[PDB]
Amino acid sequence: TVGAVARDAEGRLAAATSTGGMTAKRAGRVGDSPVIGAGTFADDGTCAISATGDGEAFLRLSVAHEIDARMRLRGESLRSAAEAVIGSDLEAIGGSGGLIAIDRDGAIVTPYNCEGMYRGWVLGSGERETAIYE
Amino acid sequence: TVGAVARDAEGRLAAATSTGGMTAKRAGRVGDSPVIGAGTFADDGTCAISATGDGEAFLRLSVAHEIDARMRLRGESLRSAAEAVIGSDLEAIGGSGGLIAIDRDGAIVTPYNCEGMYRGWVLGSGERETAIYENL
Amino acid sequence: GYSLAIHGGAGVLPRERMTAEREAATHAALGRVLSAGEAVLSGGGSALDAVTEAVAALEDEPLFNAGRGAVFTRDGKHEMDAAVMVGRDRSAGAVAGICGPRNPVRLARAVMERTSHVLMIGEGALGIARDAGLAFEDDAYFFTQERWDSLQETLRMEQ
Amino acid sequence: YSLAIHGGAGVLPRERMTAEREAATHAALGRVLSAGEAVLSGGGSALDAVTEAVAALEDEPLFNAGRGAVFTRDGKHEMDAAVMVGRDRSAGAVAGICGPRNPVRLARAVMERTSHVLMIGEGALGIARDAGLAFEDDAYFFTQERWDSLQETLRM
Ligand code: NA
Ligand code: NA
């Protein structure tokens, strides 16, 4: 699974996700990537999210929507919500994976609960990083 | 779209939904019914939900999950949450439809914002009702 | 004690167009569905068995847009979606774009119970139906004249 | 503006990660950031940014989307993709497809050309063709490492 989240010059958000799925998956299996509120999500009032990991766990917990809900209903920060869901909720259901997300103010979080996550970000400053592990 | 939600004697919940889709639908279109957290949902800590209506609106708002979230995060009742999402949120984005739901204590709510919703319930007492419009 | 709630869709006929015969027929169908789910709970069955049997009944009733009496696509075929979910562990199974299985909800359940997946589509989904030994029906079984006329009228009103 | 990307949490284990592969991986991620950066830098939309970024990740054979997509049990590709715009919660998605060079561009074609937020099978491919999107054979998508991953996985 691969994905991207962006915050525009006007503070407008968008998310996109694409995947080949899971190696030796049963033909016809659909994961979280194409299900808005599970693996892909964007609302300019909260955050944009693109997830990667056990697709079934992400579908069952509605991970992307849960983070949007925690921001709206408990007034949590994107970081607090995203960290809680990937760190605790996803662990509790026995799922592995992570998540890139950008809030409406441009805060980027890239939590994961597994060995690593191919990831990167670039700012309007030109400032850039890419990562695999730490 | 059709569906059912149940609570057993121990308070265990389940939900199921089935649909033939939408008249003159585009081949390939998938609505809310088969997407858990949108049209179908069950958690013994909150409620079981089966939705019917404009699938896209239910997918965009994650209606079933929103109701589970409002119960868990704000401590709302199934009625308060379900009625708010179908009555207000679904209306606001211009979607039509409704929802049957049963909470973990057995409270049943069947909100809809449209002409009617073919529906009913039966209790362990034997007590039963069916409805189409607002009356029984 | 146990309880069951059901629906056969929000796409109801407007009250001013609803006849007393159709109203009675509709309440009869809903009554049969409640009995199907009640029998399960009454017999000490699971919430999952209750909603499966109830939804299988709603599929079987031609007044309701699931299984038999399923609406038609633009191209005059049925594409049927279904899901089950159990609240104990949020275990789930679902299918989309299916046609042939008599009771799509029984396939949705077969997915949950036979695979590690919570959603399956196309021939992979039908393969699980066959494995689970679920009943298949011809296109005629699902066909209802009213839905067919609904399509033809709907297509006509797009011209 | 800001852009974040990922190429999956299905990372190669540290003990199998060489300095060359590590460098190759960071290079691929760098090219993706540039694709999305170019859009935002030019005053383009958040939607254009994530579309172009994900199209780049699809094009990179190191990452499990488009080219370098993992294989199913039956040695074929089934690719899922989605876009969503936060302004109006407008969305498009596809599942179980193979052929479109850039599934994410089909996901976007669904959002922009239909009133639907998820489409499957031949209906989804029909929108790709309408949108004039590029189709590719299974050869284009094929990467030896994914094929070997399947063959090793099937040893079970
Ligand atoms: Na039926
Ligand atoms: Na790729």
Author numbering:
A (entry chain D): 180 to 313
B (entry chain B): 180 to 315
C (entry chain A): 6 to 164
D (entry chain C): 7 to 162
What does the paper say about this structure?
RhIaaA has 51% sequence identity with E. coli IaaA (EcIaaA44). Like EcIaaA and other Ntn-family enzymes, the pro-enzyme is expressed as a single chain that undergoes autocatalytic cleavage into two subunits, a and b, which constitute the mature a2b2 heterotetrameric enzyme. We assayed the activity of RhIaaA towards the same set of β-Asp dipeptides used to assess LmIadA and found that it could hydrolyze all of them with no apparent preference towards β-Asp-Arg/Lys. To confirm the structural basis for the lack of substrate specificity, we solved the structure of the wildtype enzyme at 2.7 Å resolution and compared it to that of EcIaaA. The crystal structure of RhIaaA shows the expected heterotetrameric architecture. The enzyme displays high structural similarity to EcIaaA (0.58 Å RMSD across 230 Cα pairs, PDB code 2ZAL44), with the active site residues being almost identical in both sequence and conformation. In EcIaaA, the Asp portion of the substrate is bound by T197, R207, D210, S211, T230 and G231, as well as the catalytic T17944. These residues are all present and in the same conformations in RhIaaA (T183, R193, D196, S197, T216 and G217, and the catalytic T165). As is the case with IadA, the substrate likely binds oriented in a way that positions the non-Asp portion of it facing a large opening in the active site. This presumably results in minimal interaction between IaaA and the substrate residue bound to Asp by the scissile isopeptide bond, which would enable the active site to accommodate a wide range of β-aspartyl dipeptides.
